[PDB]
Structures are given as structure tokens and as C-alpha cells.
Amino acid sequence: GAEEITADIPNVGEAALSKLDESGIVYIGAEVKGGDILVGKVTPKGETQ
């Protein structure tokens, strides 16, 4: 499928989505540290055993 840029990131709480907007992109002026999400993206994955 097509990779989508969005704020709906599985297995990630609301703590890491504070600096993201509705479109899933960080705000301008956001103070960020290591491991913080800048642009949220989800890739479709196949069936996993």
C-alpha cells in the first residue's frame, strides 16, 4: 500500500504526540530531544507468523 504521514502511530502514547499537529508533523518552535517524533509515518506490513 501507500505509506501515510499521520499522527495515528501504534504503540505510542499521547506523551510523544504532544509536539505533533493533526497532520502528524512537528510544530515550528518545538523543543525536541533524542528519540522524539518529528514526522509520524506508518508503513503497511504483511502477514506475520
Next chain:
Amino acid sequence: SVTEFLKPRLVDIEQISTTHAKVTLEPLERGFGHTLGNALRRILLSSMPGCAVTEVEIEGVLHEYSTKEGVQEDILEILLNLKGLAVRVAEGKDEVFITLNKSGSGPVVAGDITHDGDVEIVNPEHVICHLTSDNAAIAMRIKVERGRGYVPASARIHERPIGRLLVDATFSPVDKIAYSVEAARVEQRTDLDKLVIDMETNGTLEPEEAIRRAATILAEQLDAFVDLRDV
């Protein structure tokens, strides 16, 4: 006698300017001038409390790496200028908010800050920014905190709304300390000495208060030796 020493006293305080003073301690026995001078210099240069700007909020500004219309300086340079603000906050308050609103062409200086009477600005001629247009306006909300030492913004423990700008804080008001030990003319003895401490500060801390605070720290740290035991 031999076993009893002469304790120094504060005999003179000379205020050359608002940011420069000389403090004279007399009498001092042989060698004690240098010992006390070095101890007081190391304590004064390292562990003096003060007040510093920590947070700035400027309307329409999201981060330091930007510009504002009608202002010649960048926000980074404005924060650097605010780092040099000499503020005295009344005892009992470790936190205060002051405001700076100014419109029209001209240098925006520290004397244009609105404070609630518990805050004293020591250097009203300190230039914070320049407004280069008649339509230009600036409105900042500055946070001043009491502290000791140097606390960078990164070292502060971690919500913070976007727009609030952290400023590295140098709380110590003491900038330069010198000391000299000269001869003292006391009664008939010639072995006594006189300690002169030259203090260059930002005007926030009084000389006598600084000397007593350094002496208090030294005495409190010496108490452990005065009561030597296994702890």
C-alpha cells in the same frame, strides 16, 4: 599574648561606583591576611546568591532563531542582552515576573521595564534592543529567579508552551575579586596587617552582605573540622 589572636573587624567600606567597592578588614595577624583573603576570594567568586533572567515570552515569537519586524536585533541577540540584566528581588521571593512594552523608534533599555515594586533594576541604561520603525512595537514578559551559580537551560530538569524561551542563568553577582595585605598601624605593634578586598559586581549585592555571607559559608564548612569525629 601568644595563644590568643586579634579578631579582624570591618573598619571601612568604600563605594567607588555602583559596581565597584573596597572593603577593609583590620587587624589581622601575620599570615592570616593571605589565608582569609584567599578563602574569601574563592567563596565569593563561586557561591554567592543572586537573581537572573530565566524565561522570556515575546509576543509573536516562536523561537530564538527568528526576526521581528521593526527590531534591528534578532531574538537571540535580545536574549543575550537580557542575560546582562542586573535585578535585585526583595527578600522572600525566589521568582518574579516583569514586563517590557515599548512602541516607536529608539533604543529599548532596562529603564522601560514595568515592575511591581519588589524588583529593582540596577542598570537602567542597559540596552536590550532597538526599534527602527515608528510602527514597531515590542512586548516581552520576563521571568527572574533567585539562585546560585551557573544553571544552563539544558541542565534544567524537564509542559512548556511554544513561545517560552529559556535563558542560561548566571546567578552569581560577583564578577571580579582582588585582595591585598598591607601594613596596619595599630597601637604599638608592627606585626599586624590590613586586608583590602576589591569587589567588582553587577550592583545587586552589597559589599558587607557579601563578606558576611562568605564568612558564614566558611564557618559552617569549618564546623565539621571543629567537631572532628567518624560519621
Next chain:
Amino acid sequence: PGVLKIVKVYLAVKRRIQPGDKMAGRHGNKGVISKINPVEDMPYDENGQP
């Protein structure tokens, strides 16, 4: 080809001097900072300037 969207983010980092940084003059005198000394521990002149 195959690219649907690109998002580029620019980060400004303030780097302060620290042990391990390389400092030099204009005469080949290069070196690495070993220690950030307190002001009260540095050599000073008769006027108190370190």
C-alpha cells in the same frame, strides 16, 4: 519515482565548548580542551583578573 510525499525538518542546535573540542590559533598551535576550570582556580594577576 515512487515517492508520494517528502517532509523536511530543520533543527537548530546550540553547541557549547566542552572537553574534546579542537581549538587552534593561526600559527599551527592546535589542541584539544582537557578541562573546564572554575574561575577561582585559574591564575590571576595583581588586579584580580583571571
